[PDB]
Design a protein around this ligand. Structure first.
Ligand SMILES: [Ca+2]
Ligand SMILES: [Ca+2]
Ligand SMILES: [Ca+2]
Ligand code: NA
Length: 210
């Protein structure tokens, strides 16, 4: 009848890979604690404490799941960033008196990246001011767009659809002597792409006035 043992954590700390945006109620991992006491003196109750809005836990099986709060690798908030990557877990037996394990157990989640973000322009849309009789091979603008994704998924390149844009630099160069009487205003649709295998794009207008 004496509660002879505390619960004892097993293979802690835990390190786990999880893709971001993983659907709600998707399995993450199963935390495990040991207590050889018979009856309620060894019956365990797991719990996430402090509470984590990105994960739920089966009190009896110690099995963690995701919630209707999606996991976002590009979430700018430092408070959330940590919750998404660190799950602190408390356990107790149901004995008389009830005993906790003498410390919690951290689950370290590694958030794997999806190409879920598209490029977004820093300096577009814009209106570039130029004087007529500007000869060919003159830079007028340099387009900048950023992608919050990781590695190749965040690497932004530039394309169009009387000018040419260098795909690496985002620099916009002329190909002819510009004249007010031929075309005084150009609307140029610059398409910014990333390097994901399902490539994501983003278009905005550079308005050249002569
Ligand atoms: Ca016990
Ligand atoms: Ca992403
Ligand atoms: Ca991207
Ligand atoms: Na994201």
């Amino acid at each position: 009848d004496i509660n002879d043992n505390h619960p004892t954590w097993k293979d802690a700390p835990y390190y786990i890979n999880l893709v971001e945006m993983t659907p709600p109620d998707s399995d993450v991992t199963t935390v495990v604690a040991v207590d050889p006491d018979l009856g309620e003196n060894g019956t365990l109750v797991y719990s996430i404490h402090p509470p984590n809005k990105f994960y739920s836990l089966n009190s009896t099986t110690g099995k963690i799941r995701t919630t209707h709060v999606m996991l976002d690798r590009e979430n700018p908030d430092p408070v959330e960033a940590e919750l998404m990557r660190k799950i602190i877990v408390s356990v107790t037996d149901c004995g008389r008196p009830p005993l906790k394990a003498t410390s919690s157990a951290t689950v370290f989640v590694n958030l794997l990246d999806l190409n879920d973000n598209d490029p977004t322009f820093r300096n577009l849309p814009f209106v570039a001011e130029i004087l007529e009789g500007t000869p060919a091979g003159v830079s007028v603008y340099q387009v900048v767009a950023i992608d919050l994704d990781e590695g190749l998924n965040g690497l932004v390149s530039y394309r169009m659809q009387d000018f040419v844009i260098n795909s690496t630099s985002g620099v916009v160069t002329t190909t002819a002597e510009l004249d007010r009487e031929r075309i005084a205003e150009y609307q140029l649709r610059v398409v910014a792409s990333d390097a994901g295998t399902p490539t994501k794009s983003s278009t905005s207008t550079l308005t050249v006035r002569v």
